[PDB]
Design a protein around this ligand. Structure first.
Ligand code: 1YN
Ligand code: HEM
Length: 449
């Protein structure tokens, strides 16, 4: 029959109160009370939490007409645009749009991306000076505003960042998104909407400029190392032959930059903080860096590919502090799952955060210990033991890029600076859509040369 329910405090509002304090602890606590599968009413939504790695196969392998992403992420529509990604007309169109982004994240482009990271950090160290303190979360976000923009949109975007305040507009859009929007998509957000329109106009100009550049240098279209997401969007069609609209192109770019920015800056923050706060971990990270760099003075893709330990540090941060704490679908048909049938209309929930603390999987899960991965391989105990990037048909297409951007940034910063964190590593703050550390996050830095 139906899964057990978390008793409602009120009707309607149901369990929103305990949930919103800490959605992660909410799931953990109620797992203990009611088991692997339970349902809670939250601001009117029937939400069925799947809480053990063992049972996640049917979630991640279901087709979109059984478990819909579009029904649950559609709320993003005012940020991304009408008709884009989870507001696409069909599952099929969404997948095609996702592929246009993934198509600018090729190995050829990755080699160029490393140079971009070097370039932006070099600009940034001018601001920072020989020593000081800086907010880690801001520093990463500020770096990734410039790096992700150039990576995805091309270098032509940088003059907008430097001269037309594009970075501020991103913030206006992105602080205009409340996690509550998940429940009340219609929440007015007029500042967000003004900024989104401004970025829209700028990205329209970027497209128009690229068009005529594709006139004066069609060779660009033949060079895989110079082809970015703007170029792919300007030269592709859907499979059935239908052309893209510039409105669609703008929305896809914005969606891509969104995805491309937060989850990464938050991960780089938690990673750097944990690395510089643990002497043994920092020693190993630096030993690895010194061996890989050899006599070489800057980064390249091949070097980054060898940074196995640093990559484990990032994965360990993702186990502990995955920035998307909930993965969701709406059931369009009833769904079995253990003894239970989950009713049509329920929202199924999987939590990367819960998974990362599960004890069937990880020993002392509150400790940041990259060696649980490299040596004890604890993640491999279950097929879905670690799902920071999701899994199955909708698994994150930006992974390897994430890994690249975060590893590069951390590696370059280490090369530049000795760094120590000020205070305890914070707790996560559940106030935002993408979850990051509670401010403030400060660190002391000093130049190494
Ligand atoms: C705020 C105070 C108090 C009232 N409160 N306290 C806590 N909460 C709360 C928190 C969180 C949540 N939620 C609901 C929203 N949520 C969430 C919803 C959708 C979602 O979508 C994942 C999809 C959609 O966007 C992306 C994100 N992404 C992928 N890679 C990097 N980011 C995505 C995929 C593709 C593209 Cl192109 C763009 C985007 Cl953004 O994947 C992620 C999280 C987290 C839990 C609800 C309430 C509160 O309301
Ligand atoms: C550490 C950084 C990142 C984390 C933790 C992360 C996490 C995720 C997760 C969990 C999903 C699955 C969502 C779901 O199935 O409901 C996902 C999907 C996706 N991610 Fe990421 N992501 C990261 C970086 C990126 C980057 C950098 C991009 C683009 C540049 C990106 C683009 C996407 C896209 C397009 C999807 C949708 C796949 C689909 O629906 O088919 N992500 N991501």
């Amino acid at each position: 029959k139906l899964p057990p329910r978390v008793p409602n405090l009120i009707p309607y509002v149901g369990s929103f109160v305990s949930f919103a304090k800490n959605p992660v602890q909410f799931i953990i606590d109620n797992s203990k009370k009611y088991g692997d599968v339970f349902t809670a009413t939250i601001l009117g939504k029937e939400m069925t939490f799947l809480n053990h790695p063992k049972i996640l196969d049917t979630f991640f392998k279901a087709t979109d007409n059984e478990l819909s992403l579009r029904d649950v992420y559609r709320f993003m529509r005012p940020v991304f645009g009408t008709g884009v990604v989870y507001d696409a007309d069909s599952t099929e169109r969404m997948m095609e749009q996702v592929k246009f982004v993934s198509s600018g994240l090729t190995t050829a482009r990755f080699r160029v991306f490393v140079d971009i990271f070097e370039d932006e950090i070099a600009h940034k160290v001018k601001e920072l000076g020989p020593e000081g303190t800086v907010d880690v979360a801001e520093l990463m976000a500020d770096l990734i505003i410039f790096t992700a923009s150039r990576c995805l949109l091309g270098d032509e975007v940088r003059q907008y960042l430097s001269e037309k305040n594009l970075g501020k507009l991103y913030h206006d859009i992105d602080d205009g998104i409340s996690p509550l929007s998940f429940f009340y998509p219609s929440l007015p957000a007029p500042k967000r909407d003004k900024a989104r329109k401004a970025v829209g106009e700028i990205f329209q100009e970027l497209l128009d400029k690229r068009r005529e550049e594709h006139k004066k240098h069609p060779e660009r279209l033949l060079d895989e190392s110079k082809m970015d997401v703007v170029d792919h969007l300007l030269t592709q069609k859907y499979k059935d032959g239908q052309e893209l609209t510039d409105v669609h192109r703008i929305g896809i770019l914005i969606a891509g930059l969104f995805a491309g920015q937060h989850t990464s800056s938050i991960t780089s923050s938690w990673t750097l903080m944990n690395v510089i706060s643990n002497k043994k971990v920092l020693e190993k990270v630096r030993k690895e860096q010194e061996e890989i760099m050899g006599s070489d003075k800057v980064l390249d893709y091949d070097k980054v590919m060898k940074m196995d330990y640093l990559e484990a540090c990032m994965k360990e941060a993702l186990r502990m502090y995955p920035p998307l704490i909930m993965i969701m679908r709406m059931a369009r048909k009833p769904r079995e799952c253990e003894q239970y049938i989950i009713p049509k209309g329920n929202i199924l929930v999987v939590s990367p955060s819960v998974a990362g603390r599960c004890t069937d999987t990880y020993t002392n899960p509150d400790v940041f210990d990259p060696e649980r991965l490299t040596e004890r391989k604890e993640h491999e105990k279950f097929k879905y033991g670690a799902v920071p990037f999701g899994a199955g048909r909708h698994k994150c297409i930006g992974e390897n890029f994430a890994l690249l951007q975060v590893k590069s940034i951390i590696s370059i910063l280490l090369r530049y600076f000795d760094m120590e964190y000020i205070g305890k590593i914070p707790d996560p703050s559940y106030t935002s859509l993408v979850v990051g550390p509670s401010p403030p996050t400060r660190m002391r830095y000093k130049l190494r040369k």
